Amino acid sequence: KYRVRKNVLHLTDTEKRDFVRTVLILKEKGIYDRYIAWHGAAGKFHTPPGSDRNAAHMSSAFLPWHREYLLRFERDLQSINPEVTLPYWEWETDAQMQDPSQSQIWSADFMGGNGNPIKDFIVDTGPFAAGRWTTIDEQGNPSGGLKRNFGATKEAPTLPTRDDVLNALKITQYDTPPWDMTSQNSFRNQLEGAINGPQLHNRVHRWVGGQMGVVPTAPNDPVFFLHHANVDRIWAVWQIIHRNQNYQPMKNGPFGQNFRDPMYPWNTTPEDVMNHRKLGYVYDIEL
Amino acid sequence: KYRVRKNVLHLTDTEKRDFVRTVLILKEKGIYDRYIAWHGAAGKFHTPPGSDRNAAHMSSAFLPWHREYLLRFERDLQSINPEVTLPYWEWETDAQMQDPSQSQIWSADFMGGNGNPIKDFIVDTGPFAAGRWTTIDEQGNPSGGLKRNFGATKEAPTLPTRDDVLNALKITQYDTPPWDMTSQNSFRNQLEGAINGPQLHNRVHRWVGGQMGVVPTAPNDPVFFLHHANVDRIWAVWQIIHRNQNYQPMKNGPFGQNFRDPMYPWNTTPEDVMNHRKLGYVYDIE
Ligand SMILES: [Cu+2]
Ligand SMILES: [Cu+2]
Ligand SMILES: [Cu+2]
Ligand SMILES: [Cu+2]
Numbered sequence A: 001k002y003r004v005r006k007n008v009l010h011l012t013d014t015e016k017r018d019f020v021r022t023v024l025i026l027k028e029k030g031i032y033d034r035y036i037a038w039h040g041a042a043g044k045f046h047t048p049p050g051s052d053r054n055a056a057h058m059s060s061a062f063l064p065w066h067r068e069y070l071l072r073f074e075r076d077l078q079s080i081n082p083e084v085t086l087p088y089w090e091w092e093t094d095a096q097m098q099d100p101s102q103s104q105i106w107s108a109d110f111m112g113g114n115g116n117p118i119k120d121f122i123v124d125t126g127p128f129a130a131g132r133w134t135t136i137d138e139q140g141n142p143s144g145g146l147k148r149n150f151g152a153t154k155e156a157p158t159l160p161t162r163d164d165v166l167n168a169l170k171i172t173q174y175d176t177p178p179w180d181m182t183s184q185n186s187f188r189n190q191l192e193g194a195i196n197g198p199q200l201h202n203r204v205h206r207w208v209g210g211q212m213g214v215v216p217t218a219p220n221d222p223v224f225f226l227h228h229a230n231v232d233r234i235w236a237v238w239q240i241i242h243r244n245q246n247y248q249p250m251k252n253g254p255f256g257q258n259f260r261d262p263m264y265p266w267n268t269t270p271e272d273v274m275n276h277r278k279l280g281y282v283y284d285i286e287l
Numbered sequence B: 001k002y003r004v005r006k007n008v009l010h011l012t013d014t015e016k017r018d019f020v021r022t023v024l025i026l027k028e029k030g031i032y033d034r035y036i037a038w039h040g041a042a043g044k045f046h047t048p049p050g051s052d053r054n055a056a057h058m059s060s061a062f063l064p065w066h067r068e069y070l071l072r073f074e075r076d077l078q079s080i081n082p083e084v085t086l087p088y089w090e091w092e093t094d095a096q097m098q099d100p101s102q103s104q105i106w107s108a109d110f111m112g113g114n115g116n117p118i119k120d121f122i123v124d125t126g127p128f129a130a131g132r133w134t135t136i137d138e139q140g141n142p143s144g145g146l147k148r149n150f151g152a153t154k155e156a157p158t159l160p161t162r163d164d165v166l167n168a169l170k171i172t173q174y175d176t177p178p179w180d181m182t183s184q185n186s187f188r189n190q191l192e193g194a195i196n197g198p199q200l201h202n203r204v205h206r207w208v209g210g211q212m213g214v215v216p217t218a219p220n221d222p223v224f225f226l227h228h229a230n231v232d233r234i235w236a237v238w239q240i241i242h243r244n245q246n247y248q249p250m251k252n253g254p255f256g257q258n259f260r261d262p263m264y265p266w267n268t269t270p271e272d273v274m275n276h277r278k279l280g281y282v283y284d285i286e
Helices: A011-030 A032-043 A062-080 A164-170 A187-192 A201-208 A214-218 A224-240 B014-029 B031-042 B062-080 B162-168 B187-191 B198-208 B216-221 B223-241
Strands: A002-004 A281-283 B003-005 B282-284
Touching: A011 A032, A011 A062, A032 A062, A032 A201, A032 A214, A032 B031, A062 A224, A062 A281, A164 A187, A187 A224, A201 A224, A201 B003, A214 A224, B014 B031, B014 B062, B031 B216, B062 B187, B062 B223, B062 B282, B162 B187, B162 B198, B162 B223, B187 B198, B187 B223, B198 B223, B216 B223, B223 B282
Parallel strands: A002 A281, B003 B282
Antiparallel strands: none
16 A cells, blocks of 8 residues: 555646656666567467457456556666656546646646647657657667657547546446457446447547557557556556456456466466555555 | 486487477467467567667577576476476487488477478478467467478578587687677577577577578477577586686676566566576486
């Protein structure tokens, strides 16, 4: 319960500065790119092979995989600066703004702003602007700078709402057979946002555009973690509320999606990460 | 010094059988694919990005990466059957055969044969023949069966010799800057076989052909692990010959390559695996 994960909006200027500084060190040290590689690597690991499901997306392990991912990332942040925890991007409240792109998350002392359409949507402002921050492609090579294009798409013009989130929280079953993009009455599939998609998680990715708009390049934007922190938070809340509903499938799902299978590229199981508090962190709204 | 790793040729018919069994169980359970994927994923992790070095090859970590690789793989074998250990293919003595394709390793009770020249060099004999063993491409999709094409290439018509190995054992330095394939007087580079390549390690791969001959697909062929078992043994010998040499670079190389850097996709450092005996295994003949 010790590590407290705060809403981006409640961060002090000092906190915002400290977080960015720590990320920039993770980048400079070679560590940040391991996260990009791990995420892409899970996308190529299909469960079972030739299925549309993979280790991190399109099936039950979507939630615990990303939880494990953020935890490792946070420990790395911590090892540079023990005062630093992983903030979350409460995007359903940004959604309530007349213009969500005016959110303070996108300020130059934080994430920086939207892309420059004269420079093919290259991010120009903030700590991660072209020149200060280099990106990698799906092959592991430099790809020339962060891009963003907020709301550009027809299918994802807006961020998910507070009501979308509340409706997902009403769902009873964690997941359902056949444990994929077609599952119904599935919290997992709901939060992930395949149900009449893109909705919720998938929608945020789409809305941001740039590298975030394409799954294998998504972690290239540091806001990927802030976004996923919000997803992980929504999930933790679902668990608090539905205390007897456990992870599914317990067994006899595809290998890698069961409660006790390891989650490639790790040996970590969904069981290992089910109780977030046990992992050493808590979300501010729990207090 | 408890788990002992044997020469393929010294295995009993039943050791061979149980090894084959255990591999097949690993495949069926989905665990084998993790090894294919880890290996391909580390091949796309360049250190630094854009360099020709990657986490697992063409730089210093090649030896400790694969040692860690086989360590985890053998543990997985063990969890199915505590009697099964990783054998090693001693390809330099096989090279002394008139026709190395007649080595017992390729018998039908073990690894199976060379590919069938009529059926696109699809392997059709042994436990891993098409219809009995599915294979996977660079992108993780099914791909239609094991292939092999022994000695079919101008660049590797033959396996490496006892003398190739003996010579590599003479190099004084584990490795040398710039910690890549151009490294001179480098043990790691010699063994990997980029010096006037393909030699040794590189050569064994090209000689086998099929999935073995292209690095991101190589672990589709179970013979990968037997080959790298031998590479690992060879490093083990060298370390004993040069007892006062250590791993390099200790701190000057790219991140991922230094003594206490983690080796993607694991947190394991080279340091963690410098002592194979500490890891819980020894090779028959030491
Ligand atoms: Cu993801
Ligand atoms: Cu995502
Ligand atoms: Cu390799
Ligand atoms: Cu190899």
